[PDB]
Motif scaffolding. Structure first.
Motif, short mmCIF file in Angstrom:
data_model
loop_
_atom_site.label_atom_id
_atom_site.label_comp_id
_atom_site.label_asym_id
_atom_site.label_seq_id
_atom_site.Cartn_x
_atom_site.Cartn_y
_atom_site.Cartn_z
N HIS A 36 -33.87 -27.82 -4.29
CA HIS A 36 -33.25 -28.42 -5.44
C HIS A 36 -33.32 -27.40 -6.55
O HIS A 36 -34.40 -26.89 -6.79
N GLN A 37 -32.00 -27.45 -6.98
CA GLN A 37 -32.06 -26.61 -8.55
C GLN A 37 -32.81 -26.79 -9.54
O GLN A 37 -33.13 -26.10 -10.42
N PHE A 38 -33.31 -27.97 -9.58
CA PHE A 38 -34.37 -28.50 -10.80
C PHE A 38 -35.67 -28.82 -10.19
O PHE A 38 -36.53 -29.16 -11.10
N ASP A 103 -35.37 -34.75 -22.90
CA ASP A 103 -35.59 -33.07 -22.94
C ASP A 103 -34.94 -32.57 -21.54
O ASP A 103 -34.77 -33.42 -20.44
N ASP A 104 -34.79 -31.37 -21.47
CA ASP A 104 -34.00 -30.73 -20.23
C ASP A 104 -34.99 -30.87 -19.03
O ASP A 104 -34.42 -31.40 -17.97
N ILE A 105 -36.41 -30.83 -19.21
CA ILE A 105 -37.28 -30.96 -18.06
C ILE A 105 -37.08 -32.40 -17.83
O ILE A 105 -37.38 -32.78 -16.54
N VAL A 106 -37.18 -33.45 -18.67
CA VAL A 106 -37.03 -34.78 -18.29
C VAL A 106 -35.76 -35.01 -17.46
O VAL A 106 -35.83 -35.83 -16.36
N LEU A 107 -34.71 -34.56 -17.81
CA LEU A 107 -33.48 -34.60 -17.02
C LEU A 107 -33.62 -34.38 -15.79
O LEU A 107 -33.20 -34.68 -14.68
N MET A 108 -34.41 -32.91 -15.60
CA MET A 108 -34.66 -32.36 -14.24
C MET A 108 -35.60 -33.41 -13.53
O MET A 108 -35.11 -33.83 -12.31
N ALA A 109 -36.71 -33.91 -14.06
CA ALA A 109 -37.61 -34.79 -13.33
C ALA A 109 -36.81 -36.32 -13.00
O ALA A 109 -36.93 -36.84 -11.80
N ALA A 111 -33.45 -36.61 -12.20
CA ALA A 111 -32.79 -36.24 -11.11
C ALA A 111 -33.37 -35.97 -9.67
O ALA A 111 -33.13 -36.67 -8.79
N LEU A 112 -34.64 -35.27 -9.79
CA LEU A 112 -35.58 -35.28 -8.57
C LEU A 112 -36.09 -36.51 -8.29
O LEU A 112 -36.41 -36.74 -7.12
N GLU A 113 -36.52 -37.52 -9.30
CA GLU A 113 -36.96 -38.64 -8.75
C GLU A 113 -36.08 -39.49 -8.12
O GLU A 113 -36.36 -40.29 -6.83
N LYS A 114 -34.48 -39.57 -8.53
CA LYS A 114 -33.55 -40.34 -7.71
C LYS A 114 -33.53 -39.76 -6.33
O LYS A 114 -33.32 -40.67 -5.45
N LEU A 115 -33.66 -38.57 -6.14
CA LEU A 115 -33.47 -37.86 -4.83
C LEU A 115 -34.62 -38.36 -4.02
O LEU A 115 -34.48 -38.77 -2.78
N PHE A 116 -35.74 -38.31 -4.77
CA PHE A 116 -36.94 -38.50 -3.83
C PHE A 116 -37.01 -40.18 -3.31
O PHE A 116 -37.09 -40.37 -2.29
N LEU A 117 -36.37 -40.84 -4.31
CA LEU A 117 -36.30 -42.54 -4.01
C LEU A 117 -35.14 -42.66 -2.70
O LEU A 117 -35.79 -43.50 -1.96
#
Ligand SMILES: Cc1nnc2ccc(N(C)Cc3ccc(F)c(F)c3)nn12
Length: 125
Positions: A36-38, A103-109, A111-117
């Motif tokens: 993933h890009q993030f 925060d940019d890194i929080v927006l990243m996490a 998006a990754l959490e949604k894909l993970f779930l």
């Protein structure tokens, strides 16, 4: 800004195990999230010296990252899928704890959490 030792990826007195769900967590969940890009901030332990975050380990006491999770899956370190899923959730919550909403890194996490779930919603039997 001292870095603690990275989390263990093996433990001789901890029993190992292999299941279809743990093989899936490596082959599909980890290896697809990795691309993933993030994913790039989460592919290795936070290096407080390199990143200039001297208070990172003053706040985060149970650090976790995808590089550690990958090695743990490759070592058959986990007893079961839930133990591995807890490490992904610890990695995401550490990001939310150390930073602040929006925060940019929080927006990243986020998006990754949604894909993970989405990927762990259905696991092999
Ligand atoms: C803060 C913070 N909290 N956890 C971590 C893990 C990695 C990390 N890096 C690599 C630096 C960075 C700073 C801002 C960002 F937007 C970003 F994408 C990445 N920073 N980070």
């Amino acid at each position: 800004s001292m870095n603690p030792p990275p989390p263990e990826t093996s433990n001789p007195n901890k029993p190992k195990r292999q299941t279809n769900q743990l093989q899936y967590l490596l082959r599909v969940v980890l290896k697809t999230l990795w691309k993933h890009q993030f994913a790039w901030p989460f592919q290795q332990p936070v290096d407080a010296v390199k990143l200039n975050l001297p208070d990172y380990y003053k706040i985060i006491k149970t650090p976790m990252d995808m590089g550690t999770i990958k090695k743990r899956l490759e070592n058959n370190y986990y007893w079961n899928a839930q133990e591995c899923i807890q490490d992904f959730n610890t990695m995401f919550t550490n990001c939310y704890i150390y930073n602040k909403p929006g925060d940019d890194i929080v927006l990243m996490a986020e998006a990754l959490e949604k894909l993970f779930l989405q990927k762990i919603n259905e696991l092999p039997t």
